[PDB]
Amino acid sequence: TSILDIRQGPKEPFRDYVDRFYKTLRAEQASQEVKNWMTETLLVQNANPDCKTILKALGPGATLEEMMTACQGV
Amino acid sequence: TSILDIRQGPKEPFRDYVDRFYKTLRAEQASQEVKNWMTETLLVQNANPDCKTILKALGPGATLEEMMTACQGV
Amino acid sequence: PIVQNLQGQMVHQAISPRTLNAWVKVVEEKAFSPEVIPMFSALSEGATPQDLNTMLNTVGGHQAAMQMLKETINEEAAEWDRLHPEPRGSDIAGTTSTLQEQIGWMTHNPPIPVGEIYKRWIILGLNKIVRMYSPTSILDIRQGPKEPFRDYVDRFYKTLRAEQASQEVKNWMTETLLVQNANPDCKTILKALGPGATLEEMMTACQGV
Amino acid sequence: PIVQNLQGQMVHQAISPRTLNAWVKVVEEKAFSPEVIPMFSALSEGATPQDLNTMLNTVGGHQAAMQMLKETINEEAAEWDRLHPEPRGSDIAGTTSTLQEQIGWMTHNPPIPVGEIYKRWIILGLNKIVRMYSPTSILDIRQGPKEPFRDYVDRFYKTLRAEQASQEVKNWMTETLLVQNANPDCKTILKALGPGATLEEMMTACQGV
Amino acid sequence: PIVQNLQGQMVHQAISPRTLNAWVKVVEEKAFSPEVIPMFSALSEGATPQDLNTMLNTVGGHQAAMQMLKETINEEAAEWDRLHPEPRGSDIAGTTSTLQEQIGWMTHNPPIPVGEIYKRWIILGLNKIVRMYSPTSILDIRQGPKEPFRDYVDRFYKTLRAEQASQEVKNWMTETLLVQNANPDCKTILKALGPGATLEEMMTACQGV
Amino acid sequence: PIVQNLQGQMVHQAISPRTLNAWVKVVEEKAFSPEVIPMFSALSEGATPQDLNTMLNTVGGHQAAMQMLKETINEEAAEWDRLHPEPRGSDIAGTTSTLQEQIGWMTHNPPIPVGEIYKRWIILGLNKIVRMYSPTSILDIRQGPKEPFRDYVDRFYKTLRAEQASQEVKNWMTETLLVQNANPDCKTILKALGPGATLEEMMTACQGV
Amino acid sequence: PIVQNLQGQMVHQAISPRTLNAWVKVVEEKAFSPEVIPMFSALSEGATPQDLNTMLNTVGGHQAAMQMLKETINEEAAEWDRLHPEPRGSDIAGTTSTLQEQIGWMTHNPPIPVGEIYKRWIILGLNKIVRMYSPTSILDIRQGPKEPFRDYVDRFYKTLRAEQASQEVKNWMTETLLVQNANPDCKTILKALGPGATLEEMMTACQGV
Amino acid sequence: TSILDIRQGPKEPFRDYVDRFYKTLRAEQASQEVKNWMTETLLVQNANPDCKTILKALGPGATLEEMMTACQGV
Amino acid sequence: TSILDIRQGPKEPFRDYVDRFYKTLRAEQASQEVKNWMTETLLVQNANPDCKTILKALGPGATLEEMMTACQGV
Amino acid sequence: TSILDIRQGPKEPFRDYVDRFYKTLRAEQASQEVKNWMTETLLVQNANPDCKTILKALGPGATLEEMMTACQGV
Amino acid sequence: TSILDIRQGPKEPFRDYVDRFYKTLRAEQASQEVKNWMTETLLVQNANPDCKTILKALGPGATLEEMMTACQGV
Amino acid sequence: TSILDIRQGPKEPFRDYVDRFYKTLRAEQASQEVKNWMTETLLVQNANPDCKTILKALGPGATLEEMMTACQGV
Amino acid sequence: TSILDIRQGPKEPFRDYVDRFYKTLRAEQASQEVKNWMTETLLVQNANPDCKTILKALGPGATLEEMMTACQGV
Amino acid sequence: TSILDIRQGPKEPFRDYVDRFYKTLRAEQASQEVKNWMTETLLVQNANPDCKTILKALGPGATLEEMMTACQGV
Amino acid sequence: TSILDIRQGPKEPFRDYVDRFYKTLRAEQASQEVKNWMTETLLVQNANPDCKTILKALGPGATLEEMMTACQGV
């Protein structure tokens, strides 16, 4: 499936959803400016409501390391 | 109402509290040097306990745009 | 300190052991409560930069505090070397200058008071530390339902003394926040005095309320 | 203070660092309880106006107190310039005069004791502050049902010492209010002594009541 | 105090500011507990009558105490003028004499120790005040059911030290009342020692009882 | 200490009775809490090895502490005699040398500062004692659920100051353990600051949390 | 104390008023807790027998203690007159000798240190008093079920310091009773260390137990 | 009754308490200098808690006419 | 209606009653000395019993700003 | 019985307690200087709480005749 | 009636009984030494048991001012 | 998981806790000088209360082999 | 058993406790100087509370014969 | 009867038994060495169990004054 | 029986089991290196589970004196 379709399941650990997201992003083959937008925006918007709340609290500049570090307890 | 006693409601969106706060800070007769301190300190101090927990993590330099961005849907 | 010898020339007289111990008591036991600045400013009367560095050797060990203090001293020494192109910043901070240079500077005509100047830079760093170690914001200070207004005023001014606020903001806090955070019975009296009230009027009105 | 040099001439000897720290302890820790006036009056023994101004630099920071103090000093300096048309008010307050003028005045024959005079104006301002910071009116002081009469007498006189009352009003308060506000068991003894009783008689009668 | 100058002649050296403050602490904070007399007697070492009057200026303000003190001093000054027809009573009390007369008297051969004599009259007045401010009669001092005998002995002797009793009556109180008012468990041990027991024997027997 | 005589030669001036009493208060009443090292280092200003041995005569009586101290001094005296083949170890420790040798060494050009060196060996032994008497490991220090972060930081740094850890381990403890052992509400704020936070940032963020 | 005059001759300098007051605080407020002996030994640095008698004038008033002290001094003065057939016992106790004799003796070559000797007899009497006023036997000192081993060790050694035991008995008490009276959880650790353990090992093992 | 123990009744009009107070201050044998202090301090101190709350707001300079005017119908 | 008829309703905020009073006073066209008396006297006497109590506690010299500031909580 | 433990009974006439007290003070082996102190201080200290309240009002100079006269029928 | 007959009624304020006593004493016209005895002795003996107790606690030297001052609370 | 929060289970064999601890100490990014302190102090501090009671008796010099040998079957 | 923990039984005759105590003091490996202190201090300290109350009255000089004689049948 | 027969009755005050004992001893007319033994030994052995316990706690050297002083409370 | 057969009974004091063990070891007559192994190893392995736990806590170097001292409470 395309990257737009990848969502976090209601009880899925964030690291597994991130792995699915980036595996799909690698197959999606969009140009790097679009990949920047997708990894900033879709990855947050398609998270669980709790995890999405944690991620939005980081603001827009968050790196993937920070996003995963924040979500370990979810 | 006095700016000192504007407090974010237990379920009030932070943008609504910001609107109440700054609409009242225009009424306050204190000097601009005092209003600067009010914007810096009262806005965080009088936030909702959840939202206040978000805001204090942003540090003392945080802009109002950053504060509002962090507290979306809190 | 500086003392005139029997030859009439000015000479160093060391900051005494039990004065240093009184400063150690202030640093160790009062936990950078704001009276640390009056007590530093008192115990360092007449102190040369060598004496002041001797007093800072007990702030060392409070590694966070001593970091804030050293960086503030270095900042002011740089500001000195910027403003003034005679002692350089490290000489007035007494790290490079000799004791005899410091005493000379302090006793020339006019005096070059490297002691009192460096003591101001230290007091500015102690202010930063006293702010850091403040237990509360001035906004957190409220009068208890049975607390005497005198004791609340003491807590309020002690906290206001531990705050970054400019004198204009401190004036507004004194006029407005002190009333706002009083307990409702006492606050009723303070409101009835109106906005012009001095602290003397506020306290004599609320006495035993 | 003033000290005779080896040349026999009078010279300044600065108020020592640990004396100033003892005054800082009094200002900061005793919250203008009335013993601040005895302790000021003791620590300022022999103080020139320069020494007294050095001691007031720690009342600064208690912005309300220091305001009452400065305005009372300025009031007395104006009263001096009014009564006496030699030191002017700002010279005896040591803001304009030189240290050598102050020591000269204090050591001429007869002495012009600018130190002890200015120290009276400061003690008068400290009295105003001690009244402001009083936690209670003398009327609020009552003996508890199990409180020793000695402890109630101590609280009563401490408050009476913190009050504006003239000596005639203080005499009446001592004779009448002290009895009125005793607890009923103890008050019965005090009433039975009649109106002429001294405090010695009142205390020895109520001892352990 | 008196100090030998570089010329070898005896001269006045004033009772220091922080010694006076230590006496103010004793007067204000220890509420005429009996250690006020040891502490007065210590702080007044070498005091001339001018120094002693300087120390009494802080008992002033305790209007009852200072009345007892002044009247006892006047009584002893009258007794002096009665017994001795050189210093008169007001000269040895230092109200009329000059400082140079007081130092002369204290340093003639033999000395006329107006300081130590007047200091005895002051200690006699302080004794009267310490009795007045005693919280209890010696008869009220009892050992609590769980109180260590050491602490009861301390309370007992502190009160006995605050009492008018002659040394014969104090001896009887020590021998008899101290046993009588012990708690019954401890009292049983003290009774078993019989009447001859010293305090050392009583305390070592009751240790941890 | 060392004082220049009127002949200009350096001579011994004994560590004063009330300075020694201030050290006795530190040894007896503060139970080798870490401020004993600042207070020792202050009270021993200018101390010769004879003065330092006079100060150690009150650590004697704390038989465990004095054993650790003597063995550490002997260890450093042996290390001195090893490194340097002029004072021997027992001379710089002042057990064999004369007072005049110690003052000579301390006042030659360059100085041979047997006082400040031996004072470092004593401070090293006092460090060992302060570690022994530490009530807790740094790992045991946790913030209470209602404890102010300022008070927890004070307890944490006081314990960290009482620990054997090298500066690298102390840095890691400051960065990591201080956050780990905060209470969960406060810990949430500290986690949100990320790993780079200074203590100033941590405390201002958690202020009143 | 003894001070070299400007003429180079040794002369008396009186034990200062505020040193005597510090001894009065020790006698009155610390109730012959064992730190009274370190504090006496510190405050009496350089004391002549006249100075020591001046210090004993505040143990007078503690009639039991002063009796034990006088009789111990008289016992040692008799032992002196027995051993040595120059100062007699009453001269070294300073009751019969002149001040100039005492200073002569203390400053001849070799010195006849009547001060330090009489100070040992006083410390021996203070030891007897400290034993009498001990609140507990060393056998009564037990660790509470939640008491830190550090605090129990402090209580234990403080009591052991207040006991008649020879050093051999104190060594056995340290090795054996300290373990025996620990609480069972802590005692289990101390037993597991075996009999050879030093106090350092015992405390570091039981730290936070 | 002693002036020290004249207290305003829980429902007593302030004018009635003033009449009781000043009628008794004429009986008091104390000097005029003491009576001045009594008029200044006891009258407020012994007022009814509601009325006392009104009176303390008037400050130390307040005349008896002002005090009575403020407390009408309290 | 004439100014004498304007009264505060039992639950009316004081600011609304003041507005009605001064609107009527402007239409009443009495001379300024009478307006001074009316604004001092009728405005208090025609208030609610609670609000009238608060206003009488201010004494006779109170300005309209002070009167309205006092009554905000009623 | 020891003089220190002679106490007036809860209903005992003061004259009966005085008789018990002085009859026992003749037995006490203490010196006359101690007996003087006992007559002055114990007699009041050990009186019945009502009678003791009467006696302490008489002051320290009171004679036994005065003390007995005051306590008739107490 | 004669002075000997005047007694305090069981609930009579002492001042009223004193007034009756001295009005009768003025009519009795006995010589002054007898009046001294009567005013010292009958006036106490004919009081109520409570008031008589209070009066006896004053001892024999009490003036009429002291007697009345003592009995105000009875 | 952070090495600071690895704690021996209430019934966990000490060898299993040692395996968890040292496997995590390899993950910790702290310097070797800090890891030395961790091996010395955390391993004892975080042991099970029974096992911790055994380990503290071994003294500060104890090797891991000695610690494991002492805690067999604890 | 350790001499420190030999204690007289709640009903044990003092002679039986003395036999237990001294039979154990022969086992103790401590020096004679320590055993002297034990005979002087532990024997009293560890006595039964009744018997201990007897023994402490005898003073510090008491011989074992005197101690046993005093405690017969206690 | 002879001295050997004199015993303390189960509720008899010790002073009465002592009086009976010495009255009998005076009539018994035994030589003084025997009287010494009797007054030391029979006088204790023939006391009540409680009083005999108190007396034995005094040891063998007790004088009659001490014995009677000890037994006053029995 | 041979040394291998000697075991501690479920309630047997360790000293009795040690006595049985060494009595058997003396009869077993194995060479000293084997005796060293047996006294280190069998003596522990054949103890009760509790006593065996205490003994293993001592580690391998324990002397017989230490082993018996450790087990006195079992």
Short mmCIF file of N, CA and C in Angstrom, two decimals, chain C residues 106-205:
data_model
loop_
_atom_site.label_atom_id
_atom_site.label_comp_id
_atom_site.label_asym_id
_atom_site.label_seq_id
_atom_site.Cartn_x
_atom_site.Cartn_y
_atom_site.Cartn_z
N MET C 106 43.64 50.30 45.22
CA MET C 106 42.65 50.70 46.22
C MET C 106 43.06 51.93 47.03
N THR C 107 44.33 52.34 47.00
CA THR C 107 44.82 53.41 47.87
C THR C 107 45.49 54.56 47.13
N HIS C 108 45.61 54.50 45.80
CA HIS C 108 45.97 55.69 45.02
C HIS C 108 44.93 56.80 45.21
N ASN C 109 45.30 58.00 44.73
CA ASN C 109 44.41 59.15 44.71
C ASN C 109 44.11 59.55 43.27
N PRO C 110 42.84 59.54 42.84
CA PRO C 110 41.69 58.89 43.48
C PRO C 110 41.90 57.38 43.59
N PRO C 111 41.15 56.71 44.46
CA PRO C 111 41.24 55.25 44.53
C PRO C 111 40.70 54.58 43.28
N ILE C 112 41.33 53.46 42.94
CA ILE C 112 40.82 52.53 41.93
C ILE C 112 40.27 51.32 42.69
N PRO C 113 39.00 51.33 43.10
CA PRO C 113 38.53 50.42 44.17
C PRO C 113 38.24 49.01 43.67
N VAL C 114 39.30 48.31 43.25
CA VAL C 114 39.14 46.99 42.65
C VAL C 114 38.39 46.04 43.58
N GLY C 115 38.54 46.20 44.89
CA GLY C 115 37.74 45.44 45.82
C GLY C 115 36.25 45.68 45.70
N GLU C 116 35.80 46.92 45.83
CA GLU C 116 34.36 47.19 45.81
C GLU C 116 33.75 46.89 44.44
N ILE C 117 34.51 47.07 43.36
CA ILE C 117 34.02 46.75 42.02
C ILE C 117 33.85 45.24 41.86
N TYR C 118 34.89 44.47 42.17
CA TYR C 118 34.79 43.03 42.05
C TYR C 118 33.71 42.48 42.98
N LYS C 119 33.59 43.06 44.17
CA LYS C 119 32.49 42.75 45.08
C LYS C 119 31.12 43.01 44.47
N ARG C 120 30.98 44.04 43.63
CA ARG C 120 29.71 44.18 42.89
C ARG C 120 29.49 43.06 41.89
N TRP C 121 30.54 42.63 41.19
CA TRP C 121 30.36 41.50 40.26
C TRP C 121 29.99 40.21 40.99
N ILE C 122 30.58 39.98 42.16
CA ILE C 122 30.21 38.83 42.97
C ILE C 122 28.78 38.94 43.46
N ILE C 123 28.37 40.11 43.95
CA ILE C 123 26.98 40.28 44.38
C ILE C 123 26.01 40.06 43.23
N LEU C 124 26.39 40.45 42.01
CA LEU C 124 25.54 40.17 40.85
C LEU C 124 25.43 38.67 40.55
N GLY C 125 26.52 37.93 40.71
CA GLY C 125 26.43 36.48 40.59
C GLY C 125 25.65 35.82 41.72
N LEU C 126 25.83 36.30 42.95
CA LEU C 126 25.03 35.80 44.06
C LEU C 126 23.55 36.09 43.85
N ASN C 127 23.21 37.22 43.24
CA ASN C 127 21.82 37.48 42.88
C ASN C 127 21.29 36.41 41.93
N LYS C 128 22.05 36.09 40.88
CA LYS C 128 21.61 35.01 39.99
C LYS C 128 21.39 33.69 40.74
N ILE C 129 22.29 33.35 41.67
CA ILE C 129 22.13 32.12 42.44
C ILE C 129 20.92 32.18 43.35
N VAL C 130 20.72 33.30 44.04
CA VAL C 130 19.56 33.48 44.91
C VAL C 130 18.25 33.37 44.14
N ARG C 131 18.21 33.87 42.91
CA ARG C 131 17.04 33.64 42.06
C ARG C 131 16.86 32.16 41.74
N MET C 132 17.92 31.49 41.30
CA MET C 132 17.83 30.06 41.01
C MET C 132 17.29 29.25 42.19
N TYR C 133 17.84 29.46 43.38
CA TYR C 133 17.44 28.72 44.57
C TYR C 133 16.15 29.23 45.22
N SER C 134 15.47 30.21 44.65
CA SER C 134 14.18 30.64 45.20
C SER C 134 13.17 29.50 45.19
N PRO C 135 12.49 29.22 46.31
CA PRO C 135 11.58 28.07 46.35
C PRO C 135 10.27 28.30 45.61
N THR C 136 9.92 29.55 45.30
CA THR C 136 8.60 29.88 44.78
C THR C 136 8.70 31.07 43.84
N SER C 137 7.72 31.19 42.95
CA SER C 137 7.45 32.46 42.30
C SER C 137 6.69 33.38 43.25
N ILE C 138 6.87 34.69 43.07
CA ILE C 138 6.09 35.68 43.80
C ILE C 138 4.59 35.45 43.64
N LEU C 139 4.18 34.88 42.51
CA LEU C 139 2.78 34.55 42.28
C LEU C 139 2.28 33.41 43.18
N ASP C 140 3.18 32.53 43.62
CA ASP C 140 2.79 31.44 44.51
C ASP C 140 2.57 31.88 45.95
N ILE C 141 3.04 33.06 46.34
CA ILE C 141 2.93 33.53 47.72
C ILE C 141 1.51 34.01 47.99
N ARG C 142 0.76 33.25 48.78
CA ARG C 142 -0.58 33.62 49.23
C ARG C 142 -0.66 33.59 50.76
N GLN C 143 -1.51 34.46 51.31
CA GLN C 143 -1.79 34.47 52.74
C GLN C 143 -2.71 33.31 53.12
N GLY C 144 -2.33 32.55 54.14
CA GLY C 144 -3.19 31.51 54.68
C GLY C 144 -4.42 32.07 55.37
N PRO C 145 -5.47 31.24 55.51
CA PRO C 145 -6.72 31.76 56.08
C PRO C 145 -6.59 32.29 57.51
N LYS C 146 -5.61 31.80 58.27
CA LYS C 146 -5.36 32.28 59.63
C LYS C 146 -3.99 32.93 59.79
N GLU C 147 -3.28 33.17 58.70
CA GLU C 147 -1.93 33.73 58.77
C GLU C 147 -1.95 35.24 59.03
N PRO C 148 -1.16 35.74 59.98
CA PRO C 148 -1.07 37.19 60.19
C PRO C 148 -0.57 37.91 58.94
N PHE C 149 -1.16 39.07 58.66
CA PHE C 149 -0.75 39.84 57.49
C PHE C 149 0.72 40.22 57.56
N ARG C 150 1.25 40.48 58.76
CA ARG C 150 2.69 40.72 58.91
C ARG C 150 3.53 39.56 58.39
N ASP C 151 3.15 38.33 58.69
CA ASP C 151 3.95 37.18 58.26
C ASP C 151 3.84 36.96 56.76
N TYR C 152 2.64 37.15 56.21
CA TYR C 152 2.47 37.11 54.76
C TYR C 152 3.25 38.21 54.06
N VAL C 153 3.22 39.44 54.57
CA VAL C 153 4.05 40.51 54.02
C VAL C 153 5.53 40.15 54.07
N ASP C 154 5.99 39.55 55.17
CA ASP C 154 7.39 39.11 55.23
C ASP C 154 7.70 38.08 54.15
N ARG C 155 6.86 37.05 54.01
CA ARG C 155 7.07 36.06 52.96
C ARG C 155 7.03 36.67 51.57
N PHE C 156 6.08 37.58 51.34
CA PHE C 156 5.94 38.23 50.05
C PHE C 156 7.18 39.05 49.70
N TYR C 157 7.59 39.95 50.59
CA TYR C 157 8.78 40.75 50.31
C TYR C 157 10.05 39.92 50.22
N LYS C 158 10.21 38.88 51.05
CA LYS C 158 11.35 37.98 50.90
C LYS C 158 11.40 37.35 49.51
N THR C 159 10.24 36.93 48.99
CA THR C 159 10.22 36.37 47.64
C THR C 159 10.44 37.44 46.59
N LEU C 160 9.82 38.60 46.76
CA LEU C 160 10.01 39.70 45.82
C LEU C 160 11.47 40.13 45.77
N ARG C 161 12.17 40.01 46.89
CA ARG C 161 13.59 40.27 46.99
C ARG C 161 14.41 39.21 46.27
N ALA C 162 13.84 38.02 46.08
CA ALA C 162 14.50 36.94 45.35
C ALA C 162 14.10 36.86 43.87
N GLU C 163 13.60 37.95 43.27
CA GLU C 163 13.03 37.91 41.92
C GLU C 163 13.74 38.87 40.95
N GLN C 164 13.73 38.49 39.67
CA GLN C 164 14.41 39.22 38.59
C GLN C 164 13.76 40.57 38.28
N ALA C 165 12.53 40.79 38.73
CA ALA C 165 11.73 41.95 38.37
C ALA C 165 12.47 43.28 38.52
N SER C 166 12.33 44.14 37.51
CA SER C 166 12.81 45.52 37.61
C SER C 166 12.06 46.25 38.73
N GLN C 167 12.58 47.42 39.11
CA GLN C 167 11.93 48.17 40.18
C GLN C 167 10.52 48.60 39.80
N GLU C 168 10.25 48.87 38.52
CA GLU C 168 8.88 49.19 38.12
C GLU C 168 7.95 48.00 38.30
N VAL C 169 8.39 46.81 37.89
CA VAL C 169 7.59 45.61 38.10
C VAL C 169 7.47 45.29 39.58
N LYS C 170 8.53 45.48 40.36
CA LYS C 170 8.42 45.29 41.80
C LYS C 170 7.43 46.27 42.43
N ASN C 171 7.42 47.52 41.97
CA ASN C 171 6.44 48.48 42.45
C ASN C 171 5.02 48.02 42.14
N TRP C 172 4.78 47.59 40.90
CA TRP C 172 3.46 47.08 40.56
C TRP C 172 3.09 45.86 41.40
N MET C 173 4.03 44.93 41.60
CA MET C 173 3.76 43.77 42.43
C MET C 173 3.40 44.16 43.85
N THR C 174 4.15 45.10 44.42
CA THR C 174 3.88 45.61 45.76
C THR C 174 2.49 46.22 45.85
N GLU C 175 2.12 47.03 44.87
CA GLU C 175 0.83 47.72 44.89
C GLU C 175 -0.34 46.77 44.65
N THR C 176 -0.17 45.75 43.81
CA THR C 176 -1.30 45.03 43.24
C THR C 176 -1.32 43.56 43.64
N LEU C 177 -0.21 42.85 43.49
CA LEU C 177 -0.20 41.43 43.78
C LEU C 177 -0.30 41.17 45.28
N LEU C 178 0.35 42.02 46.08
CA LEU C 178 0.27 41.87 47.53
C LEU C 178 -1.18 41.91 48.01
N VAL C 179 -1.99 42.81 47.46
CA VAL C 179 -3.42 42.84 47.77
C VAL C 179 -4.12 41.62 47.19
N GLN C 180 -3.85 41.31 45.92
CA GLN C 180 -4.55 40.21 45.26
C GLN C 180 -4.41 38.89 46.01
N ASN C 181 -3.23 38.59 46.53
CA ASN C 181 -2.97 37.30 47.15
C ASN C 181 -3.23 37.26 48.66
N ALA C 182 -3.70 38.34 49.27
CA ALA C 182 -4.15 38.28 50.66
C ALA C 182 -5.38 37.39 50.81
N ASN C 183 -5.60 36.89 52.03
CA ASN C 183 -6.78 36.07 52.30
C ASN C 183 -8.03 36.95 52.30
N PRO C 184 -9.21 36.38 52.01
CA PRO C 184 -10.36 37.24 51.66
C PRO C 184 -10.78 38.21 52.75
N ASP C 185 -10.70 37.80 54.02
CA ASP C 185 -11.01 38.71 55.11
C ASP C 185 -10.05 39.90 55.13
N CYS C 186 -8.76 39.61 55.12
CA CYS C 186 -7.72 40.65 55.10
C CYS C 186 -7.77 41.46 53.81
N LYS C 187 -7.93 40.76 52.68
CA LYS C 187 -8.07 41.40 51.38
C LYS C 187 -9.21 42.42 51.35
N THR C 188 -10.31 42.15 52.05
CA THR C 188 -11.40 43.12 52.12
C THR C 188 -10.94 44.46 52.71
N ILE C 189 -10.15 44.40 53.79
CA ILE C 189 -9.60 45.63 54.37
C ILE C 189 -8.69 46.33 53.37
N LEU C 190 -7.80 45.56 52.74
CA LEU C 190 -6.85 46.16 51.80
C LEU C 190 -7.54 46.81 50.61
N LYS C 191 -8.59 46.17 50.09
CA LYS C 191 -9.41 46.78 49.04
C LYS C 191 -10.06 48.07 49.51
N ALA C 192 -10.58 48.09 50.74
CA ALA C 192 -11.23 49.30 51.24
C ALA C 192 -10.27 50.49 51.40
N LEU C 193 -8.97 50.26 51.56
CA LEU C 193 -8.01 51.37 51.57
C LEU C 193 -7.83 52.04 50.20
N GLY C 194 -8.24 51.39 49.12
CA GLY C 194 -8.01 51.91 47.78
C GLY C 194 -6.59 51.75 47.29
N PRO C 195 -6.33 52.21 46.06
CA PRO C 195 -5.05 51.91 45.40
C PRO C 195 -3.85 52.68 45.94
N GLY C 196 -4.05 53.83 46.58
CA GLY C 196 -2.93 54.67 47.01
C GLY C 196 -2.20 54.23 48.27
N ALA C 197 -2.68 53.19 48.94
CA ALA C 197 -2.19 52.85 50.28
C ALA C 197 -0.71 52.50 50.29
N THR C 198 0.01 53.03 51.28
CA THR C 198 1.37 52.59 51.59
C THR C 198 1.33 51.29 52.38
N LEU C 199 2.48 50.61 52.45
CA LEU C 199 2.57 49.40 53.26
C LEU C 199 2.30 49.68 54.73
N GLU C 200 2.71 50.84 55.24
CA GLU C 200 2.40 51.20 56.61
C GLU C 200 0.89 51.23 56.85
N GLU C 201 0.15 51.86 55.94
CA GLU C 201 -1.31 51.91 56.05
C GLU C 201 -1.94 50.53 55.91
N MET C 202 -1.47 49.73 54.96
CA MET C 202 -1.98 48.37 54.79
C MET C 202 -1.76 47.53 56.04
N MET C 203 -0.56 47.58 56.61
CA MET C 203 -0.26 46.76 57.78
C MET C 203 -0.99 47.24 59.03
N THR C 204 -1.03 48.55 59.27
CA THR C 204 -1.76 49.03 60.45
C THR C 204 -3.25 48.77 60.33
N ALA C 205 -3.81 48.81 59.12
CA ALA C 205 -5.22 48.46 58.95
C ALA C 205 -5.49 46.98 59.20
#
